[PDB]
Amino acid sequence: QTVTIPCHHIRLGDILILQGRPCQVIRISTSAATGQHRYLGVDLFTKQLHEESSFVSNPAPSVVVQTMLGPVFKQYRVLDMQDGSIVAMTETGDVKQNLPVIDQSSLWNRLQKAFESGRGSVRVLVVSDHGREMAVDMKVV
Amino acid sequence: QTVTIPCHHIRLGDILILQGRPCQVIRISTSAATGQHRYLGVDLFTKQLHEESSFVSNPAPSVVVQTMLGPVFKQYRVLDMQDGSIVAMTETGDVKQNLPVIDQSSLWNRLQKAFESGRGSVRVLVVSDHGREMAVDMKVV
């Protein structure tokens, strides 16, 4: 699923959906012709570049808002860490045996450190792309 | 009105509604007991300090989201600049004769510069607090 995000709350490094793909934003610019913002990002799965311009709405008199979509992150428990992948479990107990972890900002190493010190407290934040799931960040609850 | 904003899109300097008041955020911290985020901000009207903790929702299995509220900014045309206040007009033609401009980050000076160079293109972004309106930023359309 997705969440609508106002453009004045989007910064470099944020994750957005661009051309239907989850991407990390690496450049923000503004269209001289239309006033729309343009986002250039890196596909989290394929590492290809995508760009998309913002959506401009007028939901009421004197209200103009520009938005983009962001992904709804899922939060899974970590049961085991095997070989660059993890065994994760959903809140309802559904077991996911070989969930991949993104190579971005040393997440594997951070996750390992927090797991060996407090297993039951670690969570991974997961994005989905048309079936495929990947852990892209972590939390301690 | 208000907009729901995910906490991972809130940074220092953003405007949020805290204790029912529009405030500029000056400190973000995390509660050790609950995992909620706490926002300390400055009331745009009274300049008093307010704090509020985030709202934690679970709208679906394995989805946990923390949000805060932000204001819905209105966009008015600028017709005249008089003495620290402006004559503004809404999109429907409603005239506002003495709209105040916030003393923050030299907005008065920036607004003046853009007005004298391209009057018809300048807009002010306006927040409301229980009837009272104030211009808190500007745009060139």
Which among A10, A63, A90 has the least Cβ separation from residue B72?
A: A63
Q: Report the candidate in B141, B16, B130, B128 with the shortest Cα–Cα distance to residue B74.
A: B128
Q: Are A129 and A136 in contact (CB under 8 A)?
A: no
| Cβ pair A92:B10 closer than 8 A | no
Chain B residues inside the 8 Å CB shell of A73 = 63
Q: Are B70 and B14 in contact (CB under 8 A)?
A: yes
* Domain co-membership, B111 together with B45: no
| Cβ pair B10:A11 closer than 8 A | no
Residue with tokens 């962001």: A70
Structural determination approach: X-ray
Which among B62, B72, B75 has the least Cβ separation from residue A90?
A: B62
* Domain co-membership, B16 together with B51: yes
At B55, the amino acid letter reads F
Distances (CA, A) of B24 to A4, A40, B2, B128, B137: 22, 29, 15, 14, 13
Kindly state the helix (H) or strand (E) to which residue A28 belongs, with its residue range.
strand A21-30
Using the Cβ of A30 and the Cβ atoms of chain B, whether some distance falls under 8 Å is answered with: no
Using the Cβ of B39 and the Cβ atoms of chain A, whether some distance falls under 8 Å is answered with: no
Q: Which two tokens stand for residue A59?
A: 């939901």
- Residue A77, CB half-sphere, CA atoms under 13 Å: how many? 13
| Residue A68 to chain B, least CA–CA distance (Å) | 12
Strand partners for A125: A75, A137
* Domain co-membership, B98 together with B50: no
* Domain co-membership, A33 together with A98: no
CB count within 10 Å of CB A10 equals: 20
Query: DSSP letter string over B57-124?
Result: EEEETTEEEEEEEEE--EEEEEEEE-SSEEEEE-TT--EEEEEEB--STTHHHHHHHHHHHHGGGEEE
Kindly state the helix (H) or strand (E) to which residue A108 belongs, with its residue range.
helix A107-118
Question: Phi/psi at B119 (nearest 5 deg)?
Answer: -45, -50
* Domain co-membership, B35 together with B65: yes
Domain that holds residue B79: 72-141
Q: Which two tokens stand for residue A128?
A: 């989905």
* Domain co-membership, A67 together with A1: yes
Out of A41, A56, A71, a domain closes at: A71
| Cβ pair A62:B72 closer than 8 A | no
* Domain co-membership, A42 together with A108: no
| Cβ pair B90:A61 closer than 8 A | yes
Using the Cβ of A95 and the Cβ atoms of chain B, whether some distance falls under 8 Å is answered with: no
* Domain co-membership, B22 together with B81: no
Question: Phi/psi at B118 (nearest 5 deg)?
Answer: -170, 70
Q: Report the candidate in A47, A38, A43, A42 with the shortest Cα–Cα distance to residue A10.
A: A38
Q: Which two tokens stand for residue A55?
A: 């959506």
Kindly state the helix (H) or strand (E) to which residue B18 belongs, with its residue range.
strand B15-18
- Distance (Å, whole) CA B107 – CA B21: 21
Q: Are B41 and B24 in contact (CB under 8 A)?
A: yes
Out of A71, A95, A112, a domain closes at: A71
Kindly state the helix (H) or strand (E) to which residue A116 belongs, with its residue range.
helix A107-118
- Residue A17, CB half-sphere, CA atoms under 13 Å: how many? 18
Q: Is A97 helix (H, G, I), strand (E, B) or coil?
A: strand
* Domain co-membership, B105 together with B123: yes
Split into its structural domains, chain A has a count of 2
Chain B residues inside the 8 Å CB shell of A61 = 90-92
- Distance (Å, whole) CA B88 – CA B126: 10
Q: Which two tokens stand for residue A96?
A: 């996911």
* Domain co-membership, B36 together with B96: no
| Cβ pair B5:A3 closer than 8 A | no
Q: Is A11 helix (H, G, I), strand (E, B) or coil?
A: coil
Out of B31, B49, B71, a domain closes at: B71
* Domain co-membership, B27 together with B12: yes
Q: Report the candidate in A87, A92, A129, A105 with the shortest Cα–Cα distance to residue B58.
A: A92
**String of b and e for B100-136 (b: at least 16 CB within 10 Å)?**
ebeeeeebbeebeebbeeeeeebbbbbbebeeebbbb
- Distance (Å, whole) CA A2 – CA A38: 19
CB neighbours of B60 closer than 8 A, spacing ≥ 6? none
Distances (CA, A) of A103 to A19, A51, B13, B141: 22, 22, 31, 40
Using the Cβ of B93 and the Cβ atoms of chain A, whether some distance falls under 8 Å is answered with: no
- For chain A, the helix, strand and coil percentages under 3-state DSSP, each to the nearest 5: 15, 60, 30
* Domain co-membership, B77 together with B65: no
Q: Is A117 helix (H, G, I), strand (E, B) or coil?
A: helix
Question: Phi/psi at B11 (nearest 5 deg)?
Answer: -130, 165
- Distance (Å, whole) CA A130 – CA A126: 13
Chain B residues inside the 8 Å CB shell of A75 = 62-64
| Cβ pair B62:A9 closer than 8 A | no
| Cβ pair A6:B5 closer than 8 A | yes
